[PDB]
Amino acid sequence: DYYRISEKLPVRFNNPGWFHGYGTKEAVSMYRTSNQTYGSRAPTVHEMPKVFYPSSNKFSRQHAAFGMFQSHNINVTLEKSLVTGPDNHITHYDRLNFHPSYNVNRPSI
Amino acid sequence: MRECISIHVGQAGVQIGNACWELYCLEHGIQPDGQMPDSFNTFFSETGAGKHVPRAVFVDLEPTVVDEVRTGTYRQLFHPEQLITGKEDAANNYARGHYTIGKEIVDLVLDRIRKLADLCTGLQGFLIFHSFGGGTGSGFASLLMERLSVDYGKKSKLEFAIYPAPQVSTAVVEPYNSILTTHTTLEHSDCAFMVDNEAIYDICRRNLDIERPTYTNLNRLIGQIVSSITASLRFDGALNVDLTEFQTNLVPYPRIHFPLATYAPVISAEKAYHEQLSVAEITNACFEPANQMVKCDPRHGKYMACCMLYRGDVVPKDVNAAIATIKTKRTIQFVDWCPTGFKVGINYQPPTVVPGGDLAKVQRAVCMLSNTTAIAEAWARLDHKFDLMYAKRAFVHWYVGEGMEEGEFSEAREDLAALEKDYEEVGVDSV
Amino acid sequence: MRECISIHVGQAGVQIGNACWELYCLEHGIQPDGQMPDSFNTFFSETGAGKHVPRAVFVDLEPTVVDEVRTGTYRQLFHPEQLITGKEDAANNYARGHYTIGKEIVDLVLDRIRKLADLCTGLQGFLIFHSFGGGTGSGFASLLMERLSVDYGKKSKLEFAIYPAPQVSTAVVEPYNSILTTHTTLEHSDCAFMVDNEAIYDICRRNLDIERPTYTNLNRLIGQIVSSITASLRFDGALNVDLTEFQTNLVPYPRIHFPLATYAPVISAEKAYHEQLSVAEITNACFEPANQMVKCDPRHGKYMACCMLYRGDVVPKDVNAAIATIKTKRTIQFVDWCPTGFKVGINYQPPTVVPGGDLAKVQRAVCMLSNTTAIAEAWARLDHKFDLMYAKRAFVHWYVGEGMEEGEFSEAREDLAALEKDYEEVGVDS
Amino acid sequence: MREIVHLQAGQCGNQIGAKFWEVISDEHGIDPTGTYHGDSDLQLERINVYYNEATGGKYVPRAVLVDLEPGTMDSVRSGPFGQIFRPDNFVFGQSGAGNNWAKGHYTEGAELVDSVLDVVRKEAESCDCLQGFQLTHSLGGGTGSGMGTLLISKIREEYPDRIMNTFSVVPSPKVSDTVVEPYNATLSVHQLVENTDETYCIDNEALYDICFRTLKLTTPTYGDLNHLVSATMSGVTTCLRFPGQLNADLRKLAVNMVPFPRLHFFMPGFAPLTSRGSQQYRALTVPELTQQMFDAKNMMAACDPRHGRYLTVAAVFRGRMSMKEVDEQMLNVQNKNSSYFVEWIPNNVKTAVCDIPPRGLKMSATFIGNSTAIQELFKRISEQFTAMFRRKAFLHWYTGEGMDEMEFTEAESNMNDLVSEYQQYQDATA
Amino acid sequence: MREIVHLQAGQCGNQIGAKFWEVISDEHGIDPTGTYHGDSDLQLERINVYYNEATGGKYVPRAVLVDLEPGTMDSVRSGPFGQIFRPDNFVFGQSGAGNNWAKGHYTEGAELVDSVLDVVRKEAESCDCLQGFQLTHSLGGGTGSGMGTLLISKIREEYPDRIMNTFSVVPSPKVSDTVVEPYNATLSVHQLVENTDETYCIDNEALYDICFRTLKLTTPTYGDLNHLVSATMSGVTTCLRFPGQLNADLRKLAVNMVPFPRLHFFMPGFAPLTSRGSQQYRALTVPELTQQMFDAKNMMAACDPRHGRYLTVAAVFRGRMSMKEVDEQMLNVQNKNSSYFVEWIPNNVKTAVCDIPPRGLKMSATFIGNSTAIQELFKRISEQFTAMFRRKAFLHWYTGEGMDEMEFTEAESNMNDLVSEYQQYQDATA
Amino acid sequence: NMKLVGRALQDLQDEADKKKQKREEMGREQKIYNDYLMQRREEEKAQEKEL
Ligand SMILES: Nc1nc2c(ncn2[C@@H]2O[C@H](COP(=O)(O)OP(=O)(O)OP(=O)(O)O)[C@@H](O)[C@H]2O)c(=O)[nH]1
Ligand SMILES: Nc1nc2c(ncn2[C@@H]2O[C@H](COP(=O)(O)OP(=O)(O)OP(=O)(O)O)[C@@H](O)[C@H]2O)c(=O)[nH]1
Ligand SMILES: Nc1nc2c(ncn2[C@@H]2O[C@H](COP(=O)(O)OP(=O)(O)O)[C@@H](O)[C@H]2O)c(=O)[nH]1
Ligand SMILES: Nc1nc2c(ncn2[C@@H]2O[C@H](COP(=O)(O)OP(=O)(O)O)[C@@H](O)[C@H]2O)c(=O)[nH]1
Ligand SMILES: [Mg+2]
Ligand SMILES: [Mg+2]
């Protein structure tokens, strides 16, 4: 009814009625304890924040609980291609061209 | 997850303890039963009954301060094993609280520290609250960190306490307690937060128009302090500030762990109605010695390191402009060996407002933590008043009769003189 | 961007501030709460929530005058921190307001002025209002100017003040305050606007037909003087004139910063029905000795500098014809070293009219700030009254009892004698 | 190709420059938005002289608006053609000079010069082949008379070969708007003689009597004064922007106009000035244009040429006319008024023809002329400068800025030497 | 083929990469889910430079995110493009550093270096031919300036021939947010000089300066700073990912930009930065990009190159241009500002052209340059580190970690010997 | 080019209106909270008389 709520804050901060259960101290008495001023009055709408954002930690809790990432693969050996063509992969330890050619004559290799 | 445990000590520690926590229940929005109708885990903890249980231990040597918590509003909020009491008190006697009465229940609290330390997985630091004047707030308090040091060596042990006011005093035998506890706050303390009630009295009457304050009004602002430091833990920020981060950027030397706080703005709702508040306005009020809560003038000394904890709808742009305006000033001095003496922290969360409080609801604020050498005059006044006792031995028979050797009085006086000398060496400028 | 902060001192300063800030409230349209239903930003400080706060520091040594403002119509308009009070006053004693009672609250006003101009980005100057008669307006004003100059070596200090009237007087020990204060307005001032209440008494009765005026009628007439000065800062004009623009063209020597003001037309509605008002008509009454706000005749002296401030439905054509017509008048004198002694300011917005005010609405206006040497005779009458006191040493024990040395009485008398001497040197024509 | 960067300084220069940018916007058919709504192709052929290209068929004025006070910039951007200028081109400080030349030239002008220097260097390097610069300001000010001269001295070192025209505003002695105006005037002419290719001394009083008699406007505002000034600057570059039978430019005139570098001061002239009652009884002819312009009453300087000798005379004509008639009319006036022309230079008149008439009019002409009678005003300034300076009046304002005293002597000496050699060319035997 | 693994360190870095991976995903048309909603086939031809393939037309980042405080990545994954990242690539410790270089480098960095080394090994072996790595961090932290240096030294031993680029954040002296900042800065650059192929000096204060002046943003957040920094990183590799008329990559720039291995610091600039008002009046051309870049105001480093000499200059262009206008410009800027370019290297500039413009824009440019101005920053830290270290202040924190005192001296010596030879390269004869 | 300039001016106007509406909402909200305070301070004195 009052100020535009942040629409991420829970309805506990949209309705001050949900914090019932306190304010049950009686003034108007000679036996009034000074410490009763602490938590003396139930809140209203006006004393309740427009914006609430959390720091949600379920984004880290399960990774922390189930351990950090590690890898114990023995060897993924993946000697690669120095030429972009899918037909040929000539390696630095290899001095030989692949994809044998189509020559009319002199096929001495 | 990052957690903090409160070890509130004495009548002070109990009274600020609940006052800090009536603010804690409201920011996260917990009903006094202990339910939501995870920002809370740094103080609260889920049980089998799924409520948010205090990680806070209350210890006192007099029960009448405790049962008003066990009979007050939040009785069911707390678990009564946490609230620790004793049959007899120290009665403004450091010796009784350290040697005779303290050793009865010293083990019992330590298990309760351990069980709470068991519950938390990664603890950040320990929040200790006591008072320099009372025997329980001095004697039992002094005992507990010394073994808390040897149990948890690496753990941060933060220190909030009431330093005796320079003129008004609730006690006459306070300096004997005050001098003797200073050993523990130097070899068993990481960072101190000494404050006197007199300067709090001056601020609220001058600013908040409350001509007749009480401890409650004082307790709410002190609660506003501890919320500000650990706010960066609770809710996110552009530049989060954990407890280790400002610990590093405040302490030049291990013997120098005595900074000074400041909270701004601190104004009444009527006067706040017609004053625009900006970053520069609130950061200038932090440097006014009329708003310091320790009866010392930083202009008489020099800042070694200033720590900044902004809070509210603050922009990093106006922060740097405010720092630049502050830096271009001559009476605001700095030590020669600290060209850059700022540690800035920013939070989007605005400070909440408690029912029956004094501070107006404001969209922005600032917390200030300067370590300055102008505090050197504070223990000097204590030294003159203590030396005005010990030469002719007033009240010594009480402390000797408890079972402790009068030679410790001279050594305790000597170390504070040495500590004052160390602050003078920092005041020296390089050739 | 332009900002002016009022430092009104004393009962005169507070009552003037009530009248002046009322006019500023109606000029920009300020509600008594302070909400509009950026010409205001020179005077009214805009807060975040749409609230506007005057940039003024009302200071007085007794609470009763300021408390009326605290319970007045504009109670919510002013900052309670701005309004500074004191338990005990100087009670027509410069010494009490300079060495015993001032120092208790010299410090507090400095921090309040500190906060006001810290909000401001570019401060033009300080408009300071006080009186030479009262102890607070003379004593307490003297220290703040002394402390303002060391805090602000460059910031301007205009000085609008009440001078003792030549014949009527509200106090007996007034010349002692008047003589001792004149040192401050010499070495800690940039321009000065001493006004005696007697001159307006004749002017209001002769022109506005109010046979029984009051301080509000006087304070309202002080009101648009500052408004017509600051009109160029607040509103756009053909010839905008800042305070630095007219400070330069009014002060030939640092020891001569005492010009004389003049406002025109000043005429009631039933009167104003019968005369067409033109630029020539209003500028001629600005030179008439019967309309001077100081009891002196410039026909006995010579003008050395004049600031022209037109306002309203004015045309630069009619400006020059009026200036030329003025210059062909032997009855007006001028010094040899100032062939051109005019500084014309032109503003668009005509002066607004306050309710309960004698002045009718007029489409055009005119303001004068003429520095002439005929003011020097006024100080001479003060010298006659002061010296004839000091021979018998009347009321001296009051000032000595406060803790100030009686030798300053002779020194202050000696300074003004030299000040009168300097004005005769300019009166000499080579 | 041949571009112009329009400099702009002070409240004076900003207002005429706003008026000047309005008129040539009408000539090139530019809306206040920035697009082109004209009809003829020649209306958009040479627009790159004054305008710079922007995307979406937009053009930006190539002007650098400078003022020490931000208030005039608000008035500039709030006009009809307020949103045509690039906001980056607006350079301004927070504090003015207060009619003090020394503050504008040394203290406060030293901070704003770097920002303006970067804007003009950005604009100058943008154009391919910059013909030269052009500046408008007032000599009776603090920024244009002050820092505006400092801008000239710096960029002449930077860009020596480029032409420098100034439409400087010379104060009149009959009517003055400043008291310290001789000091600002004297210390500026010394800067003019050293570094200026050509000067147009335009006097406001000489504008006023035109509106009284020539046009018979009851209420001539400053807009009318600026409009007449705007017509002059358009009439100089009209042949540059538009083709004609005999073309010219600024260097076409300045090469032909100054026999010696020490003489670069002219009296500008504009021909078609008639009142509304004069439109009924008139016949637009070339002789009427020549007859009206050679009248000294049409002159926008404060000097009667009949007391001096016409060294050189220009007549820049706008329209389609007979070239025989303009040839004959100049020949007739050269022979009729033989005594008023010097004899050592034959055919003292230079003419150019621009085919395009001004918008809304059929025939017009412009006149630029150097005559010996212009020393009548410089000596009159010395009549006022020495009168005030001999008593050291108004000196502490300047002396407080850090400058010495010999600057007044050397500036007076240069102008005394200037009028001395100016005089000798009057009585010279061929 | 030519792949890049993006290393991520510190709170500074984690927000930089998150903003970076947003804009490049926009450039490659990847939704928040991870699928490809693009339109041009060029938008998906070279994606595997940064992404890896996932089943279902999905793509995953090849980035490893490291921080000692777990609170940061929760803010990272809760962003708009947070779910795109793979949880295993997130690596974190339980306790932070507290801006302490020591605990991150020696004490707690030792526990975390093993895990990050595994995933970067896994990402390395996944791709065909890695071009090199890329790490972003801040020099004022405890992890990025601390542990973040430990990964570089490890991967240089493991992968020496691969390129190593680092877009570090160097603290500013005027605005500093950490007291212990000089100790961390002095102990990080020594690690930076020994093991790094290429480094960019990014300062927040300079970034703060740009949005104040160039963009005129009233409330610029840190995201706008991340917007500018990510714009720099995209413009570096836009020639790698997309074809152009003149191609380049990291190694083409790396070979040309360091004449000697000891100087691998370059200050980057971004061309098309205009405020929204500035978009109204502009004409988008190659010279305007050259103009706006070659202003020192546009720079996001805290050093003015006017005080130094340009060693080498690089300008990578994004869009479709005709390079004759491009190529004529750097030839000119070399010639005119000949004093700021060294003479022992002719034709100091190398340029690259990428055909594909940035999304939502027509043309842009990025600049990489080596000047002598960078020693202005290192000696500035020396002015501050020596002041802190002469009194042994804040030493016990670093001393408690088990390091000796000679490490500060040698790191001080290494940075001093770096600037000493750096001065000699400034004052060298051809 | 005209697509680009239209987009830029639209964004500028949108953010201007957003800032204006936030400022408009802010001022009214503080006013109401004050309205709670005047009654809240009215009950406490009315409570005090009853004691
Ligand atoms: N600021 C503040 N100080 C308090 C408060 N309660 C007690 N103190 C201070 O504590 C000092 C005395 O110690 P107490 O806490 O009262 O009692 P104690 O510490 O348990 O020691 P004993 O009195 O011997 O039982 C006094 O000088 C007070 O200044 C409080 O609620 N707020
Ligand atoms: N014109 C005018 N003069 C006033 C007004 N109020 C006070 N004065 C002058 O002030 C003089 C007396 O000093 P006050 O201003 O009343 O008091 P003060 O300046 O605070 O000094 P103290 O009386 O010592 O406290 C009288 O002679 C009046 O001339 C006013 O409203 N209008
Ligand atoms: N003719 C004419 N003169 C003007 C105009 N605006 C100002 N002036 C003259 O400029 C002089 C004041 O110049 P000023 O503002 O002090 O110049 P600045 O100090 O450089 O800004 C006055 O004497 C006016 O007569 C105008 O629109 N037209
Ligand atoms: N430019 C920019 N700087 C940032 C940003 N976030 C943090 N910083 C800077 O990073 C520094 C803090 O680094 P820190 O978190 O201690 O690094 P870490 O110890 O490695 O985690 C501060 O000085 C900030 O100025 C950002 O988004 N942009
Ligand atoms: Mg107790
Ligand atoms: Mg009084």
Short mmCIF file of C-alpha atoms in Angstrom, two decimals, chain B residues 85-309:
data_model
loop_
_atom_site.label_atom_id
_atom_site.label_comp_id
_atom_site.label_asym_id
_atom_site.label_seq_id
_atom_site.Cartn_x
_atom_site.Cartn_y
_atom_site.Cartn_z
CA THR B 85 25.81 -17.28 35.24
CA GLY B 86 27.58 -17.48 38.58
CA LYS B 87 26.60 -17.39 42.22
CA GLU B 88 29.04 -14.66 43.31
CA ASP B 89 30.53 -11.71 41.44
CA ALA B 90 33.89 -9.94 41.50
CA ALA B 91 32.42 -6.57 42.63
CA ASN B 92 34.72 -4.23 40.69
CA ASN B 93 37.74 -6.39 41.53
CA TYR B 94 40.07 -7.61 38.79
CA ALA B 95 41.78 -9.99 41.23
CA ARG B 96 38.57 -11.79 42.22
CA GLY B 97 37.51 -12.21 38.60
CA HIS B 98 40.96 -13.42 37.53
CA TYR B 99 42.08 -15.62 40.41
CA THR B 100 39.38 -16.60 42.92
CA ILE B 101 35.94 -16.56 41.31
CA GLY B 102 36.93 -16.98 37.65
CA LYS B 103 38.53 -20.40 38.05
CA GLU B 104 35.28 -22.00 39.25
CA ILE B 105 33.40 -21.80 35.94
CA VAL B 106 36.37 -21.34 33.60
CA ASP B 107 36.09 -24.88 32.23
CA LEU B 108 32.30 -24.77 31.80
CA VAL B 109 32.31 -21.80 29.42
CA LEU B 110 35.26 -23.23 27.48
CA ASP B 111 33.32 -26.36 26.56
CA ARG B 112 30.46 -24.14 25.38
CA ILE B 113 32.91 -22.20 23.23
CA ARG B 114 34.17 -25.51 21.84
CA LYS B 115 30.69 -26.85 21.08
CA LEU B 116 29.81 -23.66 19.21
CA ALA B 117 33.19 -23.82 17.48
CA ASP B 118 32.31 -27.43 16.59
CA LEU B 119 29.03 -26.36 14.97
CA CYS B 120 30.59 -23.79 12.65
CA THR B 121 32.76 -25.12 9.83
CA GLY B 122 34.87 -22.11 8.88
CA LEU B 123 35.03 -19.46 11.58
CA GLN B 124 36.19 -15.95 10.73
CA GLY B 125 36.68 -14.31 14.13
CA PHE B 126 35.50 -14.07 17.71
CA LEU B 127 33.45 -11.07 18.84
CA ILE B 128 34.35 -10.20 22.44
CA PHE B 129 32.39 -7.55 24.36
CA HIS B 130 33.20 -6.46 27.91
CA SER B 131 33.94 -3.43 30.09
CA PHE B 132 37.18 -2.13 31.60
CA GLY B 133 35.53 -1.15 34.88
CA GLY B 134 33.73 -4.08 36.46
CA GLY B 135 35.52 -7.02 37.99
CA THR B 136 33.74 -9.62 35.89
CA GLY B 137 34.18 -7.45 32.80
CA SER B 138 37.88 -7.19 33.66
CA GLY B 139 38.94 -10.24 35.70
CA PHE B 140 37.02 -13.08 34.08
CA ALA B 141 37.32 -11.35 30.70
CA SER B 142 41.11 -11.09 31.00
CA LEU B 143 41.42 -14.79 31.88
CA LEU B 144 39.49 -16.11 28.92
CA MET B 145 41.47 -14.85 25.90
CA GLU B 146 44.80 -16.05 27.33
CA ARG B 147 43.72 -19.67 26.97
CA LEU B 148 41.51 -18.81 23.99
CA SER B 149 44.79 -17.70 22.41
CA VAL B 150 46.53 -21.01 23.13
CA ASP B 151 43.51 -23.02 22.01
CA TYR B 152 42.80 -21.17 18.74
CA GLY B 153 46.12 -19.55 17.86
CA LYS B 154 45.35 -18.29 14.36
CA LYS B 155 41.75 -17.25 15.00
CA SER B 156 40.89 -13.56 15.05
CA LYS B 157 39.74 -12.33 18.47
CA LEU B 158 38.10 -8.93 18.06
CA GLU B 159 37.73 -6.63 21.06
CA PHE B 160 34.86 -4.27 21.94
CA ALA B 161 35.02 -2.69 25.38
CA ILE B 162 34.12 0.36 27.46
CA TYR B 163 37.11 2.52 28.29
CA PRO B 164 36.54 4.61 31.44
CA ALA B 165 35.43 8.16 30.73
CA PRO B 166 37.97 10.93 31.49
CA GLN B 167 35.74 12.94 33.85
CA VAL B 168 32.53 11.08 34.73
CA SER B 169 33.14 7.78 36.50
CA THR B 170 30.91 5.03 37.83
CA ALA B 171 33.84 3.70 39.84
CA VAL B 172 36.74 4.74 42.03
CA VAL B 173 38.77 1.50 41.88
CA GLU B 174 38.36 1.40 38.10
CA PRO B 175 41.99 2.33 37.16
CA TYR B 176 43.43 -0.67 39.06
CA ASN B 177 41.16 -2.84 36.94
CA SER B 178 41.89 -0.73 33.85
CA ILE B 179 45.68 -0.86 34.24
CA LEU B 180 45.83 -4.59 34.99
CA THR B 181 43.72 -5.70 32.02
CA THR B 182 45.90 -3.80 29.53
CA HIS B 183 48.35 -6.71 29.54
CA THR B 184 45.74 -8.99 27.99
CA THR B 185 44.64 -6.50 25.38
CA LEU B 186 48.22 -6.32 24.02
CA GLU B 187 49.44 -9.95 23.99
CA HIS B 188 46.00 -11.56 23.62
CA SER B 189 44.12 -9.17 21.32
CA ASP B 190 44.02 -8.59 17.57
CA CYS B 191 42.11 -5.29 17.37
CA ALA B 192 40.54 -3.09 20.06
CA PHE B 193 37.53 -0.77 20.00
CA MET B 194 37.75 1.24 23.22
CA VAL B 195 34.91 3.73 23.77
CA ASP B 196 33.80 5.90 26.68
CA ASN B 197 30.17 6.57 27.55
CA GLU B 198 30.79 10.31 28.06
CA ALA B 199 31.51 10.99 24.39
CA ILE B 200 28.43 8.95 23.44
CA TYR B 201 26.48 11.13 25.86
CA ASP B 202 27.78 14.26 24.14
CA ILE B 203 26.96 13.05 20.63
CA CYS B 204 23.34 12.02 21.21
CA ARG B 205 22.31 15.15 23.10
CA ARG B 206 24.06 17.41 20.57
CA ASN B 207 22.74 15.55 17.52
CA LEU B 208 19.67 13.47 18.40
CA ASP B 209 17.93 15.96 20.75
CA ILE B 210 17.50 13.29 23.46
CA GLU B 211 18.18 15.36 26.57
CA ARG B 212 17.79 12.31 28.86
CA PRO B 213 19.44 9.24 27.31
CA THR B 214 20.08 5.87 28.97
CA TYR B 215 22.16 2.76 28.28
CA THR B 216 19.53 1.67 25.76
CA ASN B 217 20.17 4.69 23.52
CA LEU B 218 23.89 4.07 23.94
CA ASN B 219 23.42 0.36 23.24
CA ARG B 220 21.60 0.94 19.93
CA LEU B 221 24.41 3.00 18.38
CA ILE B 222 26.98 0.46 19.56
CA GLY B 223 24.80 -2.16 17.89
CA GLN B 224 24.81 0.03 14.80
CA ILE B 225 28.62 -0.21 14.83
CA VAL B 226 29.07 -4.00 14.86
CA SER B 227 26.42 -4.37 12.15
CA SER B 228 28.41 -2.04 9.89
CA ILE B 229 31.73 -3.92 10.04
CA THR B 230 30.14 -7.32 9.41
CA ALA B 231 27.57 -5.99 6.92
CA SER B 232 30.02 -6.68 4.08
CA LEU B 233 29.96 -10.27 5.28
CA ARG B 234 26.16 -10.52 5.37
CA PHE B 235 25.18 -8.94 2.07
CA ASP B 236 27.10 -8.47 -1.15
CA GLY B 237 28.89 -5.33 -2.25
CA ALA B 238 30.98 -3.94 -5.05
CA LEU B 239 34.01 -4.20 -2.76
CA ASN B 240 33.35 -6.69 0.05
CA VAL B 241 35.27 -6.33 3.31
CA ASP B 242 35.89 -9.41 5.45
CA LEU B 243 37.44 -9.16 8.89
CA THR B 244 40.93 -10.15 7.78
CA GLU B 245 40.96 -7.48 5.09
CA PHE B 246 40.62 -4.41 7.31
CA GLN B 247 42.71 -6.13 10.00
CA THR B 248 45.67 -6.06 7.62
CA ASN B 249 45.00 -2.48 6.52
CA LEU B 250 44.86 -1.01 10.02
CA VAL B 251 47.82 -2.35 12.06
CA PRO B 252 51.29 -0.94 11.28
CA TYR B 253 53.03 -2.74 14.16
CA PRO B 254 51.87 -5.60 16.43
CA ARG B 255 51.89 -3.37 19.53
CA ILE B 256 49.59 -0.88 17.77
CA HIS B 257 46.06 -2.30 17.53
CA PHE B 258 44.02 0.57 18.99
CA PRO B 259 41.95 2.27 16.27
CA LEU B 260 39.01 4.63 16.71
CA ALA B 261 35.54 4.31 15.22
CA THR B 262 33.04 6.86 13.90
CA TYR B 263 29.49 6.46 12.61
CA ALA B 264 27.90 9.02 10.30
CA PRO B 265 25.33 10.40 9.74
CA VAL B 266 23.85 10.41 13.25
CA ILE B 267 20.92 12.86 13.22
CA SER B 268 17.36 13.19 14.43
CA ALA B 269 14.40 12.58 12.13
CA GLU B 270 13.21 16.18 12.45
CA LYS B 271 16.57 17.65 11.42
CA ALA B 272 17.11 15.03 8.70
CA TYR B 273 13.85 16.15 7.07
CA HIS B 274 15.50 19.27 5.61
CA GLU B 275 19.16 18.28 5.15
CA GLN B 276 20.20 16.58 1.94
CA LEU B 277 22.72 13.84 2.69
CA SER B 278 25.51 12.94 0.26
CA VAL B 279 28.77 11.01 0.45
CA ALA B 280 30.85 14.16 1.00
CA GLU B 281 28.54 15.45 3.73
CA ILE B 282 28.64 12.24 5.75
CA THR B 283 32.38 11.67 5.28
CA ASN B 284 33.13 15.17 6.58
CA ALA B 285 31.17 14.49 9.77
CA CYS B 286 33.39 11.45 10.36
CA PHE B 287 36.46 13.70 10.64
CA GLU B 288 34.88 16.11 13.12
CA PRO B 289 36.34 15.42 16.60
CA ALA B 290 33.01 16.54 18.07
CA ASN B 291 31.61 13.26 16.69
CA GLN B 292 34.39 10.95 17.88
CA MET B 293 33.33 8.54 20.62
CA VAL B 294 36.73 8.75 22.34
CA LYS B 295 37.65 11.91 24.25
CA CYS B 296 40.69 12.72 22.11
CA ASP B 297 41.31 15.11 19.24
CA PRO B 298 42.93 13.54 16.13
CA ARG B 299 44.20 17.01 15.17
CA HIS B 300 46.57 16.76 18.13
CA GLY B 301 48.04 13.63 16.53
CA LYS B 302 48.37 12.11 13.07
CA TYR B 303 46.48 9.28 11.38
CA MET B 304 48.55 6.24 10.53
CA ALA B 305 45.76 4.37 8.72
CA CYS B 306 42.10 5.12 8.02
CA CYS B 307 39.61 2.36 7.19
CA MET B 308 36.37 3.09 5.39
CA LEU B 309 33.07 1.17 5.47
#
